[PDB]
Design a protein around this nucleic acid. Structure first.
Lengths: 502, 475, 349, 493, 184
RNA sequence: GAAGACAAGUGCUUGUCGUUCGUUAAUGGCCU
């Protein structure tokens, strides 16, 4: 039981628990009346009206294991409608960021902490920021290209947020979860909801694609596999809710992650297609048919490899001609019309197969000309016209093992009109490193000819994309957003305030 | 109309209005330039406001009464500061004010003179040969208030000092509604229920021009220096005039005309519009008794112009906490699948006594009752030979009509499975030559794939059966 | 001039209530509409006009809170589980009290309700309440701005109506009193300031099939107070019937014997009484029947003489379904079934 | 606060050949009654104007059936020998009938006793008599005389124009909507003739080759006609003077064809064709004439026609066999003082200022399993899953949404032996499908670690456990051998 | 050429540095119950209750006094403990907010109007221990803080008075408790 | 692993810990 509060009379008792329900106990006849589901567990109940007018309360959002996610909620006592709910923007980081200790329940889960497991976790959680440098705390964020809302894949959901009005406009669930059907209780708190891991838009903006993974319950016969479910969603410009047209169970067969996704541009099929790269490196071309209202696989490319590279990235050539694909230590250039290697009659060693020094983290192209590749150790910049590298930068001191593979991609984006920004992060210490970090934004153009601008932010930075208003947006641990960009009058005064025992 | 009597201050920043409220007349001042819950309640049921006038140091309005006395109202606090009481008790039909002197009309035709400074009745005063009088306005000669104008269907210019009627003006058939001095020569008379304003001359004693509105004239206002006269019409319209005093010249029709029609299409009545130099003010009643206003610049405006107002005539209610339908604006929106198509990534698309010829016949056309006559055959020597004498193009179409029956009927892939293999056995060499096997044999590849994934799960269930079955049989 | 002539109504007018300080009338019936008519002698125009969808509206009251004198909620309900509460500008503020925090099992409908002030007496803070009816004897009490179920008040038998006395205790302090009516004619006296206990019981002399009680002579739910010092204990009590019988009780003497003799048994009507409202000064007793046309009768007080001149034969009433007095100006508004709220003026006041 | 989400039923990845939305409209035609006639029925045509009747030819008999009663209203029998074709005019009043004695006898419908107009056409037997679609008083008949005669029925004693040039056996002609002068006329030699009746007409304008004997010709659009001839049928574009499509998806020779347009259907324009196999297949000009739905009747089908778009009643697909059978398939379709006291209910807020509706929409009634899972009665929800009057889909949707929400053991701890036997009697059926076998694998294994100890005491479970041993090993043998083909299939790729 | 800035705010800044209080909400509804005031981690927002949107934000980046207290980058240690509604200084002057920090600082702010860039700062003396909770009766003020000599925090109770001078506050030691688990 | 503290058992043993140092299961369920 998380919080109790009496009314101003003293005849009513609000409650609060891991069950997501505000129960109003009558103390006179011991009945109760309760709102069933309130978007996560409720921390602190509070009645504010002197007449008993408003119920006001605090929310935890226990779906995120990596961040305290507080939604201040207020209600009318009469109707019990959510009136003027206030919520900060909610990312989801890769690990538990900074000193955040999950609220207390009965039994220790991966979603909550016990009493005996309370201090044994907090002592351990400091050591993960002391023993390891492996911590990244990175957030996948995608920008809506026509409405400039900023969708956050809070797990099994999307918080549709916009930073101009600084306000949450939606919270849509995107999975057949267990979410609003039941507040999870202490043995059931081990069951974690399916996790949206990828969320991209087409360049149209009329389509949003959804990759998630549903998890099994433990102690079952099928508690080993993982269903990789893909979903392709639509809405109009008028409506803010999304609508599902093709759910896809298991792309690339069963138990295969499709971890990297790039959408198609307007050149190829009016941006109504998406690509999915495996850990094996298979390429499928999902796109949209017209006479059917639904999606199919127009083109496949399925290799079977002896090994699994969990770091893949891929880039599209703006003409719609060819597909750059990055596997570990190795680039591939695919003719889209064949899904094979770019076979050349020139034989001028412009080979589709490249051989890089370390495992690829990003593949980004400024134009048809440039191509910027970050390995696990280094960053390189290779032109397309001549296949010779231009600029070398040893990111090995800044990034040794700082990132789980693939997560470098969300830090580094390319404004297609100006150029690149990579996002370099330090931790800083005096005399064991501190908890505090320091991130530097560096601006790049034309496969890193010059540094256009070095901006040094005092805290951490977890994500960068570039908004189509020619500007880069970045998050932070404190969930802040920053932009890298370019007589009668005296008779009038008295009537203003005056109008408004025996 | 709900507003009985309304009047603006000079310079047009406020108006008083007098309306009824449960058989008790109340007065109230709103602002017009961009509410006011304060009101002055008249105590008795019977006393009624009869004529109304402002004062240009508190901003006070003057209330002519049914009672026989004159209330004097300060607007800052709802208090009536002092009372100007005629000893006789008839209603006061007109009130007038300039400087310290005040002037009013008894219903027994008696002039009166009050001081605002000295708070005192100067003279009980009557004159001959004016038997009914209901509108009095004083001429602005200067500090000399003398030779004031009074009228009821006919205007008399009457001096104070010699206390006689100097000029006698022809007038109307109705009693006169509006009587205002524009210029030091010219002034307007206007009747009740008539479409005709006169413009007379004080010195000459003639009519110069007349003015004509399209319906009956209810309330009058005029600009500073005789440029603009804006007439509130009883139908609800503002028939204004531009340069009425300049030179068919006998009667002058209205120059510009202002209507107000709401957004749903209803006509809204206009009462008591104010005009100043080059800035027009409209009023109308938005609710039953609440007046809303609009300043507009009128020399820009065309000859006919309908100010259109959004009125909530059929406006459906938008509660800010509520969504467009049913749920809250802060409630989460549920995952609702509905009519989604569910596909796998394995589902490809868009990338000798024989039975041969009858099987070949039901594949040329699509025929389903005739296929099932074929597939009852189960001798493998028939199964070998029937596929063998078949066109190789037809064998590819046969496999598609197999996997559809294999998928939709689970037990059916027992006996049919031999009839799929020999298709692949005999025509394998042709089947290399077709360029896209995965496209054409997609429904075959999809059905065989979904059986393949059950292999680790079913072999897992075998042991855990045979844990128990090898156990409970012995003991 | 009529109250509906500027905008007519469709269903049979069910309940009227003026505003305690403002000039307004609230007409609403089975038409699922609320209409608010500002009242003059000459024209009576719509202030606004609210249409609810899906809820016939059988009783309507304005409610100005005793503390703020700026809330001015409008509580309206019908034969539904809920009760809308429109507050007092294109967008309307409408709250609905959908839920009973204890139990919905007693009352299935909110078709009769009265709204009364109440004092806390732990704090000297006054809030409103909503008084309901229920299953068999239950009168439930919802807090008027929060919807909290306060207190349940059972009586023997079957409830037909109730009314709300106010007793002033000192300056700044008063207690409110329920007066519930069994159908057989047993009057209960619950007090809401402390938790609901009986104060007393007394049977009406006779009175078998009883429809309505309303008390009067002071502050009632039709002619309510403005500040706490205005709250005055009532003096007249009238008990309706299904056979025309109204029984008048002097509240000074009837509170002694607890089986009191009523003053005069009014029997001028011939059918079921359906509206008993007093003047705000407590000198006139309306009595009306929704069965026969043209059936309003005025009773003078304390003389208990029915007025003889008005209403005449040619006084247009219709089947009178909803009578209401003004608080201040002495006006009289009488509904009908035709939809026309025909308005009078007691020229004394 | 949020509303409670409805439990979403499990939808498997789609097995091929799903119920396409055009297969939901054309399968509505049921209640097939079969009327015996005395000989082969040759032509069937619907009344255009109020389409409630259709004429049906026979041996010496034209009958008139109804829409709603589907029985014979009236019977024309005054003919001497076999009457081939009975069309109606576009007005709808007055129908034709061409005989074997060569006389077309046009008269009003709904009146079999007045032969209004007996046009003695050619001495060879007239097969086809139609009315013009555009001008309602010009008739055109054909003959076995290989001349088609446009009769103006003001003058039943002279053909207005002799339209000729045919090589062999004209047995269809049809008019075209954009041009009242232009007439499509199909010989039996092939060679669809196109005429301009305002010209001399004895020569055609241009012909359309049909390599096999063309038997039926019908105009579909203002620019397109359709050659229904021999084995295949081909469409033709007039201004292109060239064929657009061809569908040889039949088996035997065609006989009839029909086109209807803009009717209550997911498919806008319908093209049905008979194939003399009992086999009426339905085609569409929007979708490049692909095959959409097919009936199969007993004997060979000669005449087939559909109710028009203006039917406003139960539709019909009437197909006529050679053996004497008609085959019809159809798509069927207090006091006053009490009402014065409560009359506000039909007002619906028209002229008031503000409309405000709080009322939430009545959702679909929650099922007995979903009502239990919402109220957490999990062990009873599982027992509520195995009702014999319950779909095989929903039982799977219980077990996913009981596995996903809670664990499966909590609904299973209290199970006795008698509550356990409805589970396994479903699970013996459950593993045979591929759609459930990944899930029933969980539900069996949780029983065995739980209730294997009871299973020694219960021999009744043991028989189900031995039967479960067999069918799973059978479902091995499917899943083995179906795996064997996929490894085999990769050679040919 | 390019510039960096800060646009959108983050958390609603709940009182979890206490982690002892079960009434953690800092936000208060106003006297006139028309607008609702929350200190974010980066700003202070005034939401209108009827129109449901922000009617005014109060960023800490705009004022030097605000940025000197909260936007300090080396220490993110100071935080808004509790807003009080009225003027602590003058009896009932309106549209004022007094804000109590984590470490003895008081800021006087203006919603419903343009922010005057010179607030009435009053640094509370004797704030050796860090400020944890402040609350008020009618004109009587007390203070709860976290003091420490088990790893638990002792709580000391104090009081406030005004107009001895402007900057001065008499701090009275009403009570003290030796170690606290849940102060509520 | 240790120290600390507390409880049970008979100075000892077991047990716990809203502590510190060090390494990586209270008949208790979701409104209208």
């Amino acid at each position: 039981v998380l919080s109790l509060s009496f009314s101003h009379d003293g005849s009513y008792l609000l409650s609060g628990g891991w069950e997501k329900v505000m129960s109003l106990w009558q103390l006179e006849t011991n009945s109760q009346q309760f709102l069933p589901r309130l978007n996560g567990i409720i921390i602190d109940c509070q009645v504010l009206g002197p007449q008993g007018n408003y119920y006001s309360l605090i929310l935890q959002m226990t779906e995120n294991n990596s961040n305290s996610d507080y939604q201040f909620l207020l209600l009318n006592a009469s109707d019990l409608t959510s009136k003027l709910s206030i919520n900060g923007p909610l990312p989801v980081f890769n690990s538990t960021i900074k000193h955040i200790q999950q609220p207390i329940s009965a039994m220790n889960t991966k979603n909550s902490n016990s009493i005996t497991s309370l201090n044994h976790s907090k002592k351990k959680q400091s050591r993960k920021l002391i023993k390891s440098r492996r911590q990244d705390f990175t957030t996948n964020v995608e920008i809506n290209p026509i409405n400039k809302n900023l969708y956050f894949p809070h797990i099994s959901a999307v918080q549709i947020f916009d930073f101009y009005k600084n306000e949450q406009v939606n919270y849509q669930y995107l999975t057949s979860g267990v979410n609003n059907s039941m507040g999870k209780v202490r043995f059931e708190l081990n069951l974690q909801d399916p996790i949206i891991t990828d969320l991209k838009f087409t360049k149209d903006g009329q389509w949003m694609i959804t990759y998630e993974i549903e998890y099994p319950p433990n102690d079952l016969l099928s508690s080993k596999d993982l269903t990789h479910i893909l979903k392709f969603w639509t809405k109009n410009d008028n409506e803010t809710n999304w609508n599902l047209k093709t759910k896809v169970i298991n792309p690339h067969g069963i138990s295969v992650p499709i971890t990297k996704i790039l959408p198609s541009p307007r050149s190829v099929n009016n941006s109504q297609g998406c690509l999915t790269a495996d850990n094996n490196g298979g390429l499928k071309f999902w796109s949209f048919d017209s006479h059917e209202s639904n999606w199919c696989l127009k083109k496949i490319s399925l290799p079977n490899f002896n090994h699994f590279s969990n770091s893949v990235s891929l880039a599209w050539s703006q003409d719609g001609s060819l597909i750059f694909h990055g596997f570990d230590d190795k680039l591939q250039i695919l003719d889209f019309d064949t899904f094979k290697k770019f076979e050349s009659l020139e034989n001028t060693k412009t080979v589709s197969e490249f051989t890089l020094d370390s495992e690829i983290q990003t593949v980004k192209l400024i134009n048809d000309t440039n191509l910027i590749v970050a390995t696990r150790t280094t960053l390189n910049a290779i032109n397309l016209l001549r296949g010779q590298v231009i600029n070398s930068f040893d990111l090995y001191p800044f990034v040794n093992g700082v990132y789980k593979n693939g997560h470098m991609d969300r830090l580094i984006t390319c404004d297609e009109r100006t150029g690149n920004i990579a996002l370099v992060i330090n931790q800083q210490l005096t005399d064991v490193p501190t908890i505090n970090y320091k991130s530097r934004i560096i601006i790049f153009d034309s496969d890193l000819s010059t540094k256009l601008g070095n901006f040094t932010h005092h805290e951490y930075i977890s994500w960068i994309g570039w908004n189509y208003d020619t500007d880069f947006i970045f998050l932070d641990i404190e969930s802040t957003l920053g932009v890298v960009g370019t007589x009668x009058x005296x008779x009038x005064x008295x009537x203003x305030x005056x109008x408004x025992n025996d | 109309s709900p507003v009985l009597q309304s009047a603006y201050d000079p310079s047009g920043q406020y108006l008083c209005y007098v309306t009824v409220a449960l058989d008790k007349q109340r007065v109230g001042v709103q602002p017009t330039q961009r509410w006011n819950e304060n009101f002055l309640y008249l105590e008795d049921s019977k006393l009624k406001v009869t004529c109304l006038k402002w004062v240009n140091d508190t901003v006070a309005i003057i209330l002519g009464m049914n009672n026989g006395e004159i209330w004097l109202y300060s607007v800052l606090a709802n208090e009536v500061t002092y009372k100007f009481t005629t000893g006789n008790s008839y209603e006061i039909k007109d009130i007038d004010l300039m400087g310290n002197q005040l002037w009013c009309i008894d219903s027994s035709d008696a002039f009166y003179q009050f001081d605002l400074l000295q708070f005192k009745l100067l003279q009980h005063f009557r004159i001959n040969n004016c038997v009914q009088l209901n509108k009095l306005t004083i001429v602005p000669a200067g500090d000399s208030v003398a030779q004031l104008l009074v009228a009821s269907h006919s205007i008399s210019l009457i001096d104070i000092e010699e206390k006689k009627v100097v000029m006698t003006f022809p007038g109307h058939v109705s009693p006169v509604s509006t009587l205002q001095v524009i210029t030091n020569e010219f002034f307007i008379s206007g009747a009740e229920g008539d479409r005709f304003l006169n413009v007379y001359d004080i010195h000459s004693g003639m009519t110069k021009c007349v003015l004509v509105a399209e319906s009956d004239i209810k309330e009058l206002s005029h600009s500073g220096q005789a440029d603009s006269i804006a007439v509130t019409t009883e139908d609800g319209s503002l028939e204004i005039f531009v340069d009425p005093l300049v030179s068919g010249n006998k009667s002058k029709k209205s120059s510009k005309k202002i209507q107000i029609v709401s957004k749903d299409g209803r006509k809204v009545p206009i009462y008591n519009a104010f005009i100043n130099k080059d800035l027009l003010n409209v009023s109308w009643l938005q609710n039953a008794t609440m007046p809303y206003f609009k300043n507009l610049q009128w020399r820009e405006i065309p000859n006919e112009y309908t100010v259109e107002i959004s009125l909530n005539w059929n406006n459906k209610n938008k509660s800010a906490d509520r969504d467009l339908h049913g749920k809250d604006l802060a409630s989460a929106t549920n995952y609702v699948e509905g009519n989604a198509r569910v596909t796998s990534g394995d589902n490809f698309k868009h990338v000798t006594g024989t039975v041969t010829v009858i099987l070949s016949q039901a594949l040329q056309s699509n025929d389903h009752s005739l296929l099932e006559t074929v597939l009852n055959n189960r001798d493998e020597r028939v199964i070998r030979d029937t596929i063998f004498r078949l066109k190789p193009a037809l064998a590819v179409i046969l496999l598609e009509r197999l996997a559809e029956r294999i998928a939709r009927q689970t037990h059916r892939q027992g006996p049919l499975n031999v009839w799929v293999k020999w298709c692949l056995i005999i025509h394998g060499g042709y089947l290399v030559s077709i360029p896209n096997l995965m496209s054409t044999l997609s429904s075959l590849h999809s059905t065989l794939k979904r059986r393949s994934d059950l292999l680790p799960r079913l072999l897992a269930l075998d042991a855990r059966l045979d844990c128990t079955i090898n156990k409970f049989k012995t003991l | 001039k009529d109250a509906n002539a500027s905008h007519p109504s469709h269903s049979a007018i069910q309940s009227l209530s003026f505003h305690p300080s403002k000039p307004l009338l609230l007409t609403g019936g089975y038409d699922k509409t609320l209409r608010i008519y500002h009242i003059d002698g000459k024209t009576n125009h719509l202030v606004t006009s609210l249409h609810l969808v899906g809820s016939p509206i059988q009783t309507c009251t304005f409610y100005t809170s005793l503390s703020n004198q700026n809330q001015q909620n409008i509580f309206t309900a019908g034969r539904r589980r809920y009760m809308h509460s429109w507050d007092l500008s294109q967008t309307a503020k409408i709250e609905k009290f959908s839920r009973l925090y204890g139990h919905e099992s007693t009352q299935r409908s909110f078709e009769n309700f009265k709204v009364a002030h109440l004092q806390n007496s732990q704090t000297n803070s006054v809030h409103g309440i909503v008084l309901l009816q229920g299953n068999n004897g239950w009168i439930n009490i919802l807090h008027s701005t929060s919807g909290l179920w306060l207190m349940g008040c059972k009586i023997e038998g079957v409830i037909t109506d109730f009314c709300i006395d106010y007793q002033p205790i000192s300056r700044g302090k008063f207690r409110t009193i329920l007066i519930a009516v069994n159908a057989y004619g047993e009057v209960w006296e619950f007090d809401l300031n402390k938790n609901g206990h009986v104060i007393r019981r007394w049977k009406d002399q006779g009175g078998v099939g009883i429809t309505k009680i309303q008390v009067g002579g002071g502050t009632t739910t039709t002619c309510p107070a403005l500040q706490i010092s205005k709250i005055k204990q009532n003096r007249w009590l009238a008990v309706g019937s299904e056979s025309g019988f109204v029984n008048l009780y002097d509240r000074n003497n009837a509170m002694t014997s607890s089986t009191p003799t009523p003053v005069a048994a009014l029997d001028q009507l011939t059918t079921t009484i359906s509206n008993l409202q007093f003047s705000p000064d407590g000198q006139i007793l309306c009595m009306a029947s929704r069965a026969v046309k043209d059936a309003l009768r005025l009773v003078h007080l304390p003389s208990c003489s029915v007025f003889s001149n008005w209403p005449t034969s040619g006084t247009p009433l219709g089947k009178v379904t909803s009578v209401a007095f003004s608080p201040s100006g002495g006006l009289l508004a009488v509904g009908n079934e035709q939809g026309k709220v025909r308005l009078w003026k007691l020229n004394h006041y | 606060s949020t509303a409670r989400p409805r439990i979403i039923t499990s939808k498997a990845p789609l097995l091929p050949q799903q119920t396409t939305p055009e297969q939901r409209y054309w399968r509505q035609y049921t209640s097939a009654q079969l009327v015996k006639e005395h000989n082969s029925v040759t032509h069937i045509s619907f009344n255009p104007q109020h389409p409630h009747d259709f004429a049906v030819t026979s041996s010496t008999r034209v009958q008139i059936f109804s829409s709603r009663t589907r029985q014979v209203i009236k019977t024309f029998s005054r003919f001497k020998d076999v009457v081939y074709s009975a069309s109606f005019r576009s007005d709808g009043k007055l129908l034709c009938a061409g005989d074997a004695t060569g006389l077309v006898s046009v008269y009003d419908s709904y009146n079999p006793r007045t032969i209004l107009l007996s046009i003695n056409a050619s001495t060879h037997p007239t097969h086809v008599t139609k009315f013009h679609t555009q001008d309602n008083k010009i008739l055109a008949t054909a003959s076995d005389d290989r001349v088609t005669r446009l009769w103006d029925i003001s003058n039943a004693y002279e053909p207005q124009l002799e339209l000729t040039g045919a090589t062999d056996y004209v047995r269809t002609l049809s008019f075209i909507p954009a041009a009242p002068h232009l007439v499509a006329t199909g010989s039996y030699d092939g060679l669809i003739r196109l005429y301009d009746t305002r010209s001399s007409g004895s020569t055609p304008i241009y012909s359309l080759n049909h390599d096999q004997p063309v038997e039926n010709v019908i105009a579909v659009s203002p620019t397109q006609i359709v050659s229904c001839g021999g084995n295949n049928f081909k469409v033709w574009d007039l201004t292109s003077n060239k064929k657009l499509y061809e569908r040889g998806n039949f088996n035997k020779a065609v006989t009839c064809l029909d086109y209807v347009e803009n009717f209550d259907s997911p498919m806008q324009s319908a093209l049905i064709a008979s194939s003399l196999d009992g086999h009426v297949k339905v085609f569409d000009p929007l979708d490049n004439f692909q095959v959409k739905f097919g009936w199969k009747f007993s004997g060979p089908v000669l005449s087939c026609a559909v109710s028009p778009s203006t039917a406003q009643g139960n539709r019909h697909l009437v197909a006529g066999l050679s053996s004497g059978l008609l085959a019809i398939r159809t798509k069927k379709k207090k006091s006053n003082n009490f009402q014065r006291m409560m009359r506000g209910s039909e007002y619906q807020g028209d002229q008031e200022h503000i409309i405000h509706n709080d009322k939430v929409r009545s959702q679909r009634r929650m099922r007995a399993f979903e009502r239990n899972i919402n109220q957490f009665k999990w062990s009873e929800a599982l027992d509520n899953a195995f009702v014999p009057g319950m779909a095989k889909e929903l039982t799977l949707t219980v077990l996913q949404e009981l596995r996903k929400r809670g664990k499966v053991r909590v609904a299973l701890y209290g199970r006795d032996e008698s509550t356990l036997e409805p589970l396994l009697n479903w699970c013996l059926k459950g593993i045979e499908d591929v759609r459930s076998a990944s899930i029933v694998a969980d539900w069996v294994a949780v029983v065995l670690e739980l209730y294997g100890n009871t299973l020694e005491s219960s021999p009744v479970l043991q028989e189900l456990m031995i039967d479960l041993k067999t069918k799973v090993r059978h479902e091995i043998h499917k899943s083995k051998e179906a795996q064997r083909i996929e490894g085999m299939l990769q050679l040919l790729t | 050429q390019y510039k960096l800035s800060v646009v959108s705010g983050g958390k609603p800044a709940l009182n979890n540095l206490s982690s002892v209080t079960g009434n953690k909400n800092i936000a208060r509804l106003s006297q006139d119950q028309r607008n609702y005031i929350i200190p974010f981690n980066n700003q202070i927002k005034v939401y209108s209750v009827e129109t449901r949107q922000c009617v005014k934000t109060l960023k800490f980046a705009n004022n030097s006094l605000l940025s000197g207290i909260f936007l300090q980058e080396e220490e993110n240690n100071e935080s808004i403990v509790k807003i009080l509604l009225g003027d602590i200084t003058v009896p009932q002057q309106a549209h004022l907010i007094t804000v109590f920090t984590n470490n003895g600082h008081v800021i006087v702010l203006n919603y419903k109007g343009k922010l005057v860039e010179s607030p009435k700062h009053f640094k509370i003396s004797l704030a050796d221990e860090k400020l944890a909770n402040v609350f008020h009766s009618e004109g009587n003020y007390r203070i709860l803080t976290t003091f420490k000599d088990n790893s638990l925090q002792s709580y000391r109770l104090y009081a406030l008075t005004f107009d001895d001078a402007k900057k001065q506050f008499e701090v009275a030691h009403q009570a003290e408790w030796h170690n606290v688990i849940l102060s509520n």
